[PDB]
Structure 1
Amino acid sequence: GSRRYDSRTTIFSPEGRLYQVEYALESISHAGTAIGIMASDGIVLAAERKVTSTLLEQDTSTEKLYKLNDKIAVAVAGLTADAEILINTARIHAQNYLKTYNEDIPVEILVRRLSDIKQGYTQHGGLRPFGVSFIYAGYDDRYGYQLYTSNPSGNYTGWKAISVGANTSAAQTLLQMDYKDDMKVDDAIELALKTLSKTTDSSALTYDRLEFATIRKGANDGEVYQKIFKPQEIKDILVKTGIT
């Protein structure tokens, strides 16, 4: 029958690893680097685009940073198409929670359900896993500012600062070096960009190869604002910290 052509996507190696998860992670390691850094007064998301052509429409574009609800955003490393499938699921899940409880979904709860979906693709159904890792950046009134990551295994963990995709080894070493707990947002913005600048496989970091977002309490009094940076706004913040 058809058994002949079945790759068996959800089995263990003799060492007790999940082949497809490992190979998906290998795929993600060549993706544009994305960084999350958490401050006391906000969060930064920064990500490098997979190497641009001059003719790409860069302002009406989105490849790395997506809005989940008003209090939560994600940074993507991996297959974009795979990520959108999961993003719409997560967006719907947020709305179900709001509809049910009349309260915005706590960040971890959203992160857990997405990670639980991924986990399922590694244990049953014989389908390939999603080739995606997320950095979740969000706020809720239980824990305040939070950073999480999830990967194709459906394992998730929380961070003060983290990177995903390409060159996370170098990037993680650099964040570890310069990160400190009392940090403000504007310091974290600088740290994020300086880290990409040194780990990039490109010659030099320009506005047109980046996506950028903040999540601050920097609206008006005890409420939270997501800012997805326009190209011109990145060009400015790139000058403001002297990388160009």
Structure 2
Amino acid sequence: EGRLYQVEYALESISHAGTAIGIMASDGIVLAAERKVTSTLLEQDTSTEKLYKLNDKIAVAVAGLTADAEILINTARIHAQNYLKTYNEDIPVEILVRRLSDIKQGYTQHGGLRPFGVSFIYAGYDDRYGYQLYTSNPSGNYTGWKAISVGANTSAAQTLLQMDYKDDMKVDDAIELALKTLSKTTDSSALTYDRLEFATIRKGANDGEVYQKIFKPQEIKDILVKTGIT
């Protein structure tokens, strides 16, 4: 047949995991993930749910078993820092996503293991190719994108990206389109500021380094007061 049935079901697994978006800019990258329907008693700043920081200059927006993803996230940190210790210089986003996407095929190569049920939208910056946005899935393939989604309702999200995305837009324009996308692909009756996570990458404070903030729930309110509803 030329198919793998566990791997088609691992792709069906990430299709249960809630919707996640990532959009590039002409100078930066954005990430925007939905937390699905959740109990009132869950904590809201201690819960490491969808987004993470893999070195000074790379993030991830994950959909899957978070438990699987944690090990890959940790190995990306270890590899990135060991690269930075090897070359005294930053790890490119593509080398990092290659290394993690190998592992996710290396288990898929095999009968002694299940493959990891995790998709990974990566944002990062380097002095190879500037800002890079990557996407990677349970079989271990990877692809670069300008604007992409993973997890549940991936297709409905890419139908909202397809016609609206204009190639030149800035970071703070993409912060609109992430919420236009997520709210149209919402898995809940409506959004609230605690139900989503965001992280961004920008060219330093101004020149030199890179700026790499995670939005805390008030900063998430601050981007919702804008591009919101009436």
Shorter chain as normaliser: what TM range? over 0.9
Q: Is the 8 A contact 2:134 2:142 kept in 1?
A: yes
| Counterparts of 2:142 and 2:157, CA distance in 1 | 19
Corresponding residue to 2:94 among 108, 111, 121 = 108
> How far is the alpha carbon of 1:17 from its aligned partner?
1.1
| Counterparts of 1:213 and 1:27, CA distance in 2 | 25
| Counterparts of 1:144 and 1:113, CA distance in 2 | 19
Q: CA RMSD in A?
A: 1.1
Q: TM-score, normalised to structure 1's length? A: 0.91
Deviations 1:92-131 (A, max 9, x none): 0001111111111111001101001111001135200000
| Counterparts of 2:18 and 2:221, CA distance in 1 | 19
| 1:185 paired residue number | 171
* Higher-Rg member (1/2): 1
| Counterparts of 1:201 and 1:90, CA distance in 2 | 30
| Counterparts of 1:241 and 1:103, CA distance in 2 | 38
Detail structure 1 runs of 4+ shifted over 2 Å in the superposition: none
Identity of aligned residues (%): 100
Deviations 1:69-100 (A, max 9, x none): 01000010010000001111111000111111
Corresponding residue to 1:90 among 76, 82, 87 = 76
- The 3-state SS of whatever aligns with 1:227 is coil
Runs of 5+ unmatched residues, structure 2: none
> How far is the alpha carbon of 1:220 from its aligned partner?
2.4
> How far is the alpha carbon of 1:223 from its aligned partner?
2.2
> How far is the alpha carbon of 1:222 from its aligned partner?
3.4
| Counterparts of 1:234 and 1:204, CA distance in 2 | 15
Instruction: State the number of aligned residues.
Output: 230
Q: TM-score, normalised to structure 2's length? A: 0.97
Q: Is the 8 A contact 1:205 1:243 kept in 2?
A: no
| Counterparts of 2:183 and 2:204, CA distance in 1 | 26
Deviations 1:14-47 (A, max 9, x none): x211111110110111112111100011100000
